[PDB]
From Swiss-Prot, chain B:
Ca(2+) 2 binds at residue 102. It is found in: Cell junction, Adherens junction; Cell membrane; Endosome; Golgi apparatus, trans-Golgi network. Changing residue 63 to E: Increased affinity for L.monocytogenes InlA. Greatly increased affinity. Three calcium ions are usually bound at the interface of each cadherin domain and strengthen the connections, imparting a strong curvature to the full-length ectodomain. The lineage of its organism: Eukaryota, Metazoa, Chordata, Craniata, Vertebrata. Ca(2+) 1 binds at residue 102. It comes from Mus musculus. Homodimer; disulfide-linked. Component of an E-cadherin/ catenin adhesion complex composed of at least E-cadherin/CDH1, beta-catenin/CTNNB1 or gamma-catenin/JUP, and potentially alpha-catenin/CTNNA1; the complex is located to adherens junctions. Found in a complex composed of CDH1, RAP1A and PKP3; PKP3 acts as a scaffold protein within the complex, the complex is required for CDH1 localization to mature desmosome cell junctions. Interacts with the TRPV4 and CTNNB1 complex. Interacts with CTNND1. During apoptosis or with calcium influx, cleaved by a membrane-bound metalloproteinase (ADAM10), PS1/gamma-secretase and caspase-3. Processing by the metalloproteinase, induced by calcium influx, causes disruption of cell-cell adhesion and the subsequent release of beta-catenin into the cytoplasm. The residual membrane-tethered cleavage product is rapidly degraded via an intracellular proteolytic pathway. Cleavage by caspase-3 releases the cytoplasmic tail resulting in disintegration of the actin microfilament system. Cadherins are calcium-dependent cell adhesion proteins. They preferentially interact with themselves in a homophilic manner in connecting cells; cadherins may thus contribute to the sorting of heterogeneous cell types. CDH1 is involved in mechanisms regulating cell-cell adhesions, mobility and proliferation of epithelial cells. Promotes organization of radial actin fiber structure and cellular response to contractile forces, via its interaction with AMOTL2 which facilitates anchoring of radial actin fibers to CDH1 junction complexes at the cell membrane. Residues 1-107, 108-212 form the Cadherin domain. The chain holds residues 158 to 369 of 884 of the full protein. This is Cadherin-1. Glycans are attached at residues 125, 130, 203.
């Protein structure tokens, strides 16, 4: 019993495009063309004890979406920086907050755009204020 | 009176004024009822934090709250007809502020001093580090501190010469081999993290002098 | 009357497994706001308080999806009236205590609007709450969400006057959040439209202020 | 460093007509008022390497630009020297505009909301809504300011040109004349001012030096004469009262014939002393 | 704008000994080299309001500083006028240093990795690792440069003070003497240089205009004796060669008498003609 973001594999897209899929490029995360490879698939698991979600890459199931000390989202081993508190603002559309306060504020996934173009942009972690910032909106779609 | 338990989380980020509850008197069919609130947070300092719609009973909060400044508000609601006469006795309403884990644990000192005998047996209590957390002790784990040892200088003659109780902060000798002549001074970086060690963290130094 | 009885006081969460109207007796351990519904919000329930029986909220309308948001006190007895349906699939009543924004919806029935087309007129007829009582409507604006695309929404009634409160809903693991969109909508013959985001979810709370008809008729008209 | 205790106005690159305006503790983007409610003192902290932006309101002397975390709103609060009241002034060379970043959190910078006419915090972008113009208040008040110039001795009279056919400069009564009004303009490279008479497309207030002492308006020969450029300096404890010196020789100042308060007296350059005849009421034409 | 097509060096505020260094497409942090390997031309695009940072490599002339998005990696690639090859130059007025932000993503700025000795990226913060010192390469090369000065006629001879008590200046074979070395210090206000001989603490290279073309070393207790100051201008298509002209009279260049590459020839000023006896090699002394 849980209708809110059930466990399983998802594709992660930005709200700016329906054809760009999240995947690790080098040590960064970016949205690229569909590849049908395991690296564009993400296992979303609920952590009941800490009341959050952890998201791992299918190609590397031991690496989770996290963040470094430079404001970038990263793929690394499990830690409290891998703990996300999703806010569902529409059908399959979420804002991804870090569970813990970062710099004494709510921080969220953030993809920069140039007139709705997000090619070659890295996914970042930036302050969040509300549910109206498109750059902090992402679609998680099974399966 | 028809009033439920009322609460609002600290650090609301906007969308003010935010609706909390529409309170009412079930005598509202008899005459037109006018609502109002009194107390600290309403008409008394801090004034205007909470407001109510006079004709509908919509209770609202006008600004972000902070549980560590004020954890609960004590207001009184008033129901009154057009001629000023009360249709209900004034009702006490408590508004609790729900905690967020927004306070980092804080060690009492940047550097704690301690001393240990040269040939002490493992299990020997040495010293005690201690931190505090301002968040809600009662209802959450946001102030549940877990103490750990991050590093040890030097890493000799072993990596784990000492151990710390994660609940108390008390540091005890772990392994034998404390030699005053070769390694007289030890510097441990101790960590203090809330949410039972999974939340916000901080570090301090535990300087330990080995002696005769 | 075939009163079935919940053994012990409900905590925060509970699930009670079940062609004729019968009643379910229960108490709650903690006084507070509760969401009560069937699966999946079928059928619509009614809830009563045992005076010491008084109606609280909810309607009896066939094939109509809804749930109840109600303030339950720990030192009182309550009755859920489940009406006759169709004996195809087993049913169950779900109980959840709500400490969040759902507080803004007591004591109201929340209608589930799940048949909104791209554009056009829509109306939903329910039994009207008494004067100063509440009926609510949870609906999703048609189309894909992109935080940009928008439809025009006219909300109004036909006979009864009411004060509308419009919220946008977001959901976390802790439940619904309610965000203020529009207050004090005078619903009777309302010609004012509001632009709402496609794919976004909204809840309209309606307080009846003039009982001119047995049925309240909420209209949702959508233009480009 | 070089901007410490400098009183400045702050306007929007997204709309150069909107200035930071402090009213009842609020901060809005408002039209140019040329008063102290749009003036801000920059107070530097050597340790933070950041600035407080304090309002020059005379009735409320301790209000500073403040970020109301955790919301994204901007207002003024009492100065408590807090991190959310400090700012990084980042100058975009080329534009000569500033990005004003929060010291508490440099991820966020000032953002001009031209619809709500206020300020909010935002993450960075390439737009002009986060670019701002910081100018010394005297310069911003005087630059492109079509004004009328009255000697403080008589406020009903005005420094004017006779007419379009007589470029001589005289003192006379005020009557909404195009020869009575002047447009002050500021040249950045020369750091000096020019007084364009509005009855001419490019006529400039000039001390002719071929003649000994003579003030006549003359055509604008660019990068030519420095007697066509001036330096304006304010007078203490006075709202709109200034002194005007020349650029060619800074020892000579604009002067009504000492001390003749007549309706036909000349306007001449004269050695700088500072009596009531060498000071000017630079007002806005009503 | 004001820095368009200027050739600069770029060093770190965190470590002022580390400079932007380029070779074969790779960008790193290295010690001061005083050559083209650490020289960059800032190229301004009016419409983008951003700059390209182009390496002054003499073998590959079209390499500009590039962010290899979306990675953390910075390098020099062939110029294609790409968005990831443009940069916002933001001067922190608070501490006179520069933040270099990507035009493709203004949230990301250059971060100095002083351990790996290269560049990565970071969101804005208050750390000195994202602050950089931009400076004209001539000033950067010459300021605080303890050096040796040799005539291009004979690169084994050095300009020197004869001894500690002989304030005359002649020519002699290089022999590691403290009197054979000079500390070049740049004066911002006078836009000039002084040559402090390393056998005292106030003796600068000066033109004794009281006695013809005599050049000697004298005390610098008078700040404003313009004969103490000099202008060091680079010779076209040379690596370390300069002409040195006096500030009291710029038509006077530092001159080796003759002609002569002898071991006692006089150092003097003479009317600038530009021959080999007025060209000088400023080098780092072994
Ligand atoms: Ca707090
Ligand atoms: Ca805490
Ligand atoms: Ca707290």
């Amino acid at each position: 019993e849980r209708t809110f973001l059930p466990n399983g594999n998802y594709n992660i897209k930005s709200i700016f495009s329906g054809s760009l899929y999240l995947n690790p490029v080098s040590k960064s995360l970016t949205f690229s063309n569909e590849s049908s490879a395991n690296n564009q698939k993400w296992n979303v698991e609920y952590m009941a004890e800490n009341r959050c979600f952890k998201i791992s890459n299918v190609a590397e199931p031991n690496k989770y979406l996290s963040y470094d000390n430079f404001g970038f989202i990263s793929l690394d081993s499990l830690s409290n920086r891998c703990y996300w508190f999703p806010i569902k603002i529409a059908v399959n559309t979420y804002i991804m907050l870090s569970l813990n306060k970062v710099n004494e504020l709510d921080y969220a996934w953030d993809i920069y755009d140039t007139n709705e173009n997000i090619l070659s942009q890295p996914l970042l972690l930036l302050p969040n204020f509300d549910i109206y910032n498109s750059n902090q909106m992402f679609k998680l779609e099974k399966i | 009176w028809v009033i439920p338990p009322i609460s609002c989380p600290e650090n609301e980020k906007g969308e003010f004024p935010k609706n909390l509850v529409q309170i009412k008197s079930n005598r509202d069919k008899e005459t037109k009822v006018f609502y109002s609130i009194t107390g600290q947070g309403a008409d008394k300092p801090p004034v205007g934090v909470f407001i109510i719609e006079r004709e509908t009973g919509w209770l609202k909060v006008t600004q972000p709250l902070d549980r560590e400044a004020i954890a609960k508000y004590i207001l009184y609601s008033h129901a009154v007809s057009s001629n000023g006469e009360a249709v209900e006795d004034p009702m006490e309403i408590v508004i609790t502020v729900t905690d967020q884990n927004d306070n980092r644990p804080e060690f009492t000192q940047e550097v704690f001093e301690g001393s240990v005998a040269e040939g002490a047996v493992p299990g020997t209590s040495v010293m005690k580090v201690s931190a505090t957390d301002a968040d809600d002790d009662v209802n959450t784990y946001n102030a549940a501190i877990a103490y750990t040892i991050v590093s040890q200088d030097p890493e000799l003659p072993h990596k784990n010469m000492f151990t710390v109780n994660r609940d108390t902060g008390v540091i005890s000798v772990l392994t034998s081999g404390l030699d005053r002549e070769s390694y007289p001074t030890y510097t441990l970086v101790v960590q203090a993290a809330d949410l039972q060690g999974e939340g916000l963290s901080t570090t301090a130094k535990a300087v330990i002098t080995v002696k005769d | 009357e075939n009163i079935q009885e919940i053994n012990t006081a409900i905590s925060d969460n509970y699930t009670y497994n079940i062609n004729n109207p019968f009643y379910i007796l229960f108490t709650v351990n903690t006084t507070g706001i509760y969401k009560i519904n069937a699966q999946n919000n079928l059928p619509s329930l009614k809830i009563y308080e045992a005076i010491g029986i008084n109606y609280i909220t909810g309607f009896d309308s066939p094939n109509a999806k809804s749930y109840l948001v109600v303030l339950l006190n720990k030192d009182k007895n309550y009755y859920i009236r489940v009406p006759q349906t169709s004996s195809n699939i087993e049913n169950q009543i779900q109980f959840k205590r709500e400490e969040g924004d759902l507080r803004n919806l007591m004591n109201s029935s929340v209608n589930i609007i799940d048949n909104l087309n791209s554009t056009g007129a829509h109306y939903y007829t329910r039994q009207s709450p008494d004067v100063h009582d509440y009926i609510s409507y949870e609906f999703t604006i048609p189309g894909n969400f992109n935080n940009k695309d928008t439809s025009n929404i006219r909300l109004y009634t036909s006979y009864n006057q009411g004060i509308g409160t419009l919220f946008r809903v977001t959901e976390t693991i802790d439940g619904y959040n309610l965000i203020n969109i529009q207050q004090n909508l005078h619903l009777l013959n309302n010609t004012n439209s509001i632009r709402l985001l496609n794919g976004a979810i909204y809840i309209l709370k309606v307080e009846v202020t003039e009982l001119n008809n047995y049925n309240i008729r909420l209209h949702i008209d959508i233009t480009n | 460093n070089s901007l410490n205790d400098k009183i400045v106005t702050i306007s929007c690159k997204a709309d150069t007509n909107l200035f930071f305006y402090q009213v009842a503790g609020n901060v809005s983007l408002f039209q140019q008022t040329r008063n102290y409610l749009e003036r801000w003192r920059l107070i530097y902290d050597s340790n933070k390497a950041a600035y407080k932006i304090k309002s020059m309101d005379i009735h409320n002397t301790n209000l500073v630009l403040t970020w109301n975390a955790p919301t994204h709103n901007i207002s003024t609060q009492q100065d408590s020297n807090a991190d959310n009241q400090y700012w990084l002034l980042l100058k975009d060379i080329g534009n000569n505009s500033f990005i004003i970043a929060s010291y508490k959190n440099p991820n966020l910078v000032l953002y001009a909301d031209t619809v709500a006419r206020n300020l909010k915090l935002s993450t960075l972008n390439n737009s002009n809504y986060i670019k701002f113009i910081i100018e010394d208040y005297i310069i911003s008040d005087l630059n492109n300011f079509t004004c009328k110039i009255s000697p403080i001795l008589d406020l009903n009279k005005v420094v004017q040109q006779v007419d379009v056919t007589n470029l001589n400069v005289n003192l006379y009564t005020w009557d909404y004349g195009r020869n009575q009004k002047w447009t002050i303009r500021y040249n950045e490279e020369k750091a000096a001012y020019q007084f364009f008479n509005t009855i001419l497309s490019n006529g400039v207030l000039t001390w002719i030096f071929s003649n000994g002492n003579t003030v006549r308006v003359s055509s604008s020969n660019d990068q030519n004469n420095d007697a066509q450029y001036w330096l304006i300096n304010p007078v203490s404890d006075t709202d709109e009262t200034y002194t005007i010196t020349n650029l060619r020789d800074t020892t000579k100042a604009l002067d009504l014939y000492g001390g003749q308060t007549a309706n036909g007296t000349a306007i001449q350059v004269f050695n700088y002393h500072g009596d009531d005849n060498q000071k000017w009421n630079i007002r806005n034409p009503p």
